[PDB]
Enzyme design. Structure first.
Site, PDB file in Angstrom:
ATOM      1  N   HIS A  17       2.805  10.922   6.919  1.00  0.00           N
ATOM      2  CA  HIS A  17       2.219  10.678   8.483  1.00  0.00           C
ATOM      3  C   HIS A  17       2.959   9.786   9.294  1.00  0.00           C
ATOM      4  O   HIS A  17       3.361   8.743   8.995  1.00  0.00           O
ATOM      5  CB  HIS A  17       0.868   9.798   7.978  1.00  0.00           C
ATOM      6  CG  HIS A  17      -0.325  10.287   7.132  1.00  0.00           C
ATOM      7  ND1 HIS A  17      -1.134   9.584   6.531  1.00  0.00           N
ATOM      8  CD2 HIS A  17      -0.380  11.673   7.084  1.00  0.00           C
ATOM      9  CE1 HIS A  17      -1.742  10.280   5.900  1.00  0.00           C
ATOM     10  NE2 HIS A  17      -1.447  11.813   5.943  1.00  0.00           N
ATOM     11  N   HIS A  56       5.015   6.689   7.074  1.00  0.00           N
ATOM     12  CA  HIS A  56       4.797   6.674   5.784  1.00  0.00           C
ATOM     13  C   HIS A  56       4.473   7.547   5.064  1.00  0.00           C
ATOM     14  O   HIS A  56       3.967   8.644   5.755  1.00  0.00           O
ATOM     15  CB  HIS A  56       3.789   5.370   5.426  1.00  0.00           C
ATOM     16  CG  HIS A  56       2.253   5.543   6.306  1.00  0.00           C
ATOM     17  ND1 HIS A  56       2.115   5.412   7.397  1.00  0.00           N
ATOM     18  CD2 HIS A  56       1.584   6.422   5.393  1.00  0.00           C
ATOM     19  CE1 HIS A  56       0.735   6.206   7.607  1.00  0.00           C
ATOM     20  NE2 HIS A  56       0.408   6.480   6.460  1.00  0.00           N
ATOM     21  N   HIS A 108       0.835  -1.258   0.020  1.00  0.00           N
ATOM     22  CA  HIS A 108       0.041  -0.064  -0.113  1.00  0.00           C
ATOM     23  C   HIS A 108       1.028   1.150   0.015  1.00  0.00           C
ATOM     24  O   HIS A 108       0.585   2.315  -0.795  1.00  0.00           O
ATOM     25  CB  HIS A 108      -0.833   0.181   1.411  1.00  0.00           C
ATOM     26  CG  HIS A 108      -1.851  -1.320   1.296  1.00  0.00           C
ATOM     27  ND1 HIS A 108      -2.669  -1.778   0.220  1.00  0.00           N
ATOM     28  CD2 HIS A 108      -1.821  -2.008   2.311  1.00  0.00           C
ATOM     29  CE1 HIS A 108      -3.329  -2.817   0.792  1.00  0.00           C
ATOM     30  NE2 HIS A 108      -2.846  -3.032   1.882  1.00  0.00           N
ATOM     31  N   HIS A 146       1.837   8.991   1.444  1.00  0.00           N
ATOM     32  CA  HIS A 146       1.058   8.831   0.354  1.00  0.00           C
ATOM     33  C   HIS A 146       1.669   9.775  -0.931  1.00  0.00           C
ATOM     34  O   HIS A 146       1.773  10.891  -0.482  1.00  0.00           O
ATOM     35  CB  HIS A 146      -0.492   9.159   0.754  1.00  0.00           C
ATOM     36  CG  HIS A 146      -0.881   8.633   2.065  1.00  0.00           C
ATOM     37  ND1 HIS A 146      -1.633   7.459   1.728  1.00  0.00           N
ATOM     38  CD2 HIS A 146      -0.773   8.852   3.205  1.00  0.00           C
ATOM     39  CE1 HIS A 146      -1.925   7.053   3.181  1.00  0.00           C
ATOM     40  NE2 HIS A 146      -1.269   7.744   4.018  1.00  0.00           N
ATOM     41  N   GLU A 187      -3.587  13.508   0.964  1.00  0.00           N
ATOM     42  CA  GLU A 187      -4.873  13.196   1.453  1.00  0.00           C
ATOM     43  C   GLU A 187      -5.607  14.336   1.944  1.00  0.00           C
ATOM     44  O   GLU A 187      -6.628  14.610   1.488  1.00  0.00           O
ATOM     45  CB  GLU A 187      -4.564  11.938   2.673  1.00  0.00           C
ATOM     46  CG  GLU A 187      -3.880  10.712   1.846  1.00  0.00           C
ATOM     47  CD  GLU A 187      -4.363   9.600   2.602  1.00  0.00           C
ATOM     48  OE1 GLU A 187      -4.149   9.562   3.904  1.00  0.00           O
ATOM     49  OE2 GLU A 187      -4.664   8.580   1.890  1.00  0.00           O
ATOM     50  N   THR A 199      -6.739   6.565   7.589  1.00  0.00           N
ATOM     51  CA  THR A 199      -7.259   6.759   6.098  1.00  0.00           C
ATOM     52  C   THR A 199      -7.036   5.825   5.387  1.00  0.00           C
ATOM     53  O   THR A 199      -7.253   5.682   4.016  1.00  0.00           O
ATOM     54  CB  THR A 199      -6.357   7.990   5.416  1.00  0.00           C
ATOM     55  OG1 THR A 199      -4.926   7.395   5.178  1.00  0.00           O
ATOM     56  CG2 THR A 199      -6.465   9.433   6.325  1.00  0.00           C
TER      57      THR A 199
HETATM   58  N1  LIG Z   1      -2.737   6.662   6.589  1.00  0.00           N
HETATM   59  S1  LIG Z   1      -3.118   6.444   8.161  1.00  0.00           S
HETATM   60  O1  LIG Z   1      -4.259   7.175   8.450  1.00  0.00           O
HETATM   61  O2  LIG Z   1      -1.912   6.595   8.959  1.00  0.00           O
HETATM   62  N2  LIG Z   1      -4.007   4.864   8.142  1.00  0.00           N
HETATM   63  C1  LIG Z   1      -3.226   3.931   8.748  1.00  0.00           C
HETATM   64  N3  LIG Z   1      -2.124   4.057   9.853  1.00  0.00           N
HETATM   65  C2  LIG Z   1      -1.738   3.107  10.851  1.00  0.00           C
HETATM   66  C3  LIG Z   1      -2.393   1.679  10.362  1.00  0.00           C
HETATM   67  C4  LIG Z   1      -1.888   0.605  10.992  1.00  0.00           C
HETATM   68  C5  LIG Z   1      -2.319  -0.519  10.587  1.00  0.00           C
HETATM   69  C6  LIG Z   1      -3.398  -0.570   9.880  1.00  0.00           C
HETATM   70  C7  LIG Z   1      -4.006   0.497   9.198  1.00  0.00           C
HETATM   71  C8  LIG Z   1      -3.664   1.660   9.366  1.00  0.00           C
HETATM   72  N4  LIG Z   1      -3.759   2.850   8.831  1.00  0.00           N
HETATM   73 ZN   LIG Z   2      -1.150   7.744   5.886  1.00  0.00          ZN
END
Ligand SMILES: NS(=O)(=O)/N=C1\NCc2ccccc2N1
Ligand SMILES: [Zn+2]
Ligand SMILES: NS(=O)(=O)/N=C1\NCc2ccccc2N1
EC number: 4.2.1.1
Length: 257
Positions: free
Chosen positions: A116, A91, A61, A93, A103, A195
């Site tokens: 993020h 990470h 992802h 996007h 995002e 997200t």
């Molecule tokens: N893009 S985000 O809002 O950080 N979404 C995330 N972060 C942390 C995470 C860890 C495990 C599974 C899903 C997610 N989703």
């Molecule tokens: Zn994220």
């Protein structure tokens, strides 16, 4: 399984994750004229000097840089937060083109990418318990615009060839995430969600006003990663962003006048 393609992307996620249509989904558009300065807010305390990075992983992802979160080593405090939030991973996007990839948006403007830094509230003991709580996570979001290179990003860029495909990882010790921050810690904040699936509504979002600049060559290297596994047909890892979601009954607060 879920992804970012036309057949498994953001418009499909609600069938397996009905909270996708919830009351506090992320990301959102930040309307800067509507956000209100909150003198109740404190300065953000970003304490990363003892951060201990571990590894970098292509999870199909995005890629995650993971940290040792067994002790208070790299923590976020202050701002809208009560208590202490430990950094577990960061990470990004990003887009296929420089005009998309973030995002969150600012007055409908999309940035080329968004960082993020994910943190969990130590009162819940570990990350899996924290995601079950409305104040379990704090995510520090930083926009990336294309311009001059970000020197503190280059070590990340240079390891991406070793994690090209889904399921690859590499050692990534001694990385200093302070090198990813802009000068100013001015921010917007609102209550939202992950997200990506499972889209859990556990996040206090803290989105910095100041973007960092990265070079076109740095973001070009993000776009050479692959969503697929080794030996599978190549699908470039681009456009791994969820678009803005309805604000519903929320207010975005600004730390700055
Ligand atoms: N893009 S985000 O809002 O950080 N979404 C995330 N972060 C942390 C995470 C860890 C495990 C599974 C899903 C997610 N989703
Ligand atoms: Zn994220
Ligand atoms: N404290 S630790 O075991 O060294 N580091 C941890 N463990 C759990 C975990 C899961 C996913 C990503 C990062 C981390 N960090």
């Amino acid at each position: 399984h879920w992804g970012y393609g036309k057949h498994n992307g953001p418009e499909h996620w609600h069938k397996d994750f009905p909270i996708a249509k919830g009351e506090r989904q992320s990301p959102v558009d930040i309307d800067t004229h509507t956000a209100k300065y909150d003198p109740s807010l404190k300065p953000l305390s970003v304490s990363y000097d003892q951060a201990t990075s571990l590894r970098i992983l292509n999870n199909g992802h995005a890629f995650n840089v993971e940290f040792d979160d067994s002790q208070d080593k790299a923590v976020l405090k202050g701002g809208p937060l009560d208590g202490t939030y430990r950094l577990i991973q960061f990470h990004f996007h990003w887009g296929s083109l420089d005009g998309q990839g973030s995002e969150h948006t600012v007055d409908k403007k999309k940035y080329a990418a968004e960082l993020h830094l994910v943190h969990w509230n130590t009162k819940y003991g570990d990350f899996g318990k924290a995601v079950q709580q409305p104040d379990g996570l704090a995510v520090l979001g930083i926009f990336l615009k294309v311009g001059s290179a970000k020197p503190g990003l280059q070590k990340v860029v240079d390891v991406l060839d070793s994690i090209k495909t889904k399921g690859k990882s590499a050692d990534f010790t001694n990385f200093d995430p302070r090198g990813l921050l802009p000068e100013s810690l001015d921010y917007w904040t609102y209550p939202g969600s992950l997200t990506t699936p499972p889209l859990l509504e556990c996040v206090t979002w803290i989105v910095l006003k100041e973007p960092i600049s990265v070079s076109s060559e740095q973001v070009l290297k993000f776009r050479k990663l692959n969503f697929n596994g080794e030996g599978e047909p190549e699908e470039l890892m681009v456009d791994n962003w969820r678009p803005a979601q309805p604000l519903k009954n929320r207010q975005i607060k600004a730390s700055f006048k």
